[PDB]
């Protein structure tokens, strides 16, 4: 149900999860909630607002989500949220795909030689 898509099955499970000191591990389970939020808060998203940080994150506002606005290089918009102004950091990667393929022509054309 974690990999089904319910982060609230966590809090339904933690109703009875002591389980002979299964408290530290459910705290690290809260950790593997929150750092995956630190992955999945704007993965391919447009933006979120504060109430999405009230839903997906919890504990309304600590200085831990204010830390989340000040740890990862975050744009704390005015009641607004951005990964960046572009979220993807201008992908073109070479703007030249051709010359390295001519290096493929170097070793590959060498491979065409020595054989027959």
């Amino acid at each position: 149900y974690l990999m089904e898509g319910s982060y609230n099955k966590v809090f339904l499970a933690k109703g009875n999860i002591p389980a002979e000191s299964y408290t530290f591990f459910i705290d690290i389970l809260l950790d593997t909630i929150r750092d995956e939020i630190a992955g999945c808060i704007e993965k391919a998203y447009e933006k979120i607002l504060f109430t999405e940080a009230t839903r997906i994150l919890f504990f309304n506002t600590p200085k831990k989500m204010t830390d989340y606005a000040k740890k990862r290089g975050w744009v704390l918009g005015p009641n607004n949220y951005y990964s960046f102004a572009s979220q993807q950091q201008k992908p073109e990667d070479t703007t030249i795909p051709s010359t390295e393929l001519a290096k493929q022509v170097i070793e590959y054309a060498r491979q065409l030689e020595m054989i027959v």
Partner: protein, 128 residues
């Protein structure tokens, strides 16, 4: 220039050389001679455009230096010269060579592979 037949002597007196079917190293001979023998001539051109800056009088810039600094200004540019037309133009180029090598060398896969196997296993198990 070479005019007429005259090789009853000459190409009998070769006694060493082979007509290469170009694509058999003759191209890299030309690579050594134009790369090396062209760019040491470029070093003669830095002998020109350094020695003339140093000690060169009146033909330092008579009438052809800037005039063929134009022809030098075909493509001398700074960082990587940014031939942005030439890269998808180069997709139009390497387009051809990789499509011919791909389909045609798969035909060469028929060439080598098929009768290589046939004459192979004829020679192999027909030996018994």
């Amino acid at each position: 220039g070479a005019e007429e037949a005259e090789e009853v002597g000459v190409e009998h007196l070769l006694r060493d050389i082979k007509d290469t079917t170009v694509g058999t190293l003759s191209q890299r001979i030309t690579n050594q001679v134009h790369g090396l023998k062209g760019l040491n001539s470029k070093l003669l051109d830095i002998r020109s455009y350094l020695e003339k800056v140093a000690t060169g009088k009146l033909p330092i810039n008579h009438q052809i230096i800037y005039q063929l600094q134009d022809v030098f200004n075909l493509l001398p540019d700074v960082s990587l010269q940014e031939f942005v037309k030439a890269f998808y133009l180069k997709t139009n180029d390497q387009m051809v060579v990789v499509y011919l090598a791909s389909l045609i060398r798969s035909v060469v896969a028929l060439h080598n592979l098929i009768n290589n196997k046939i004459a192979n296993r004829d020679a192999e198990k027909k030996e018994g």
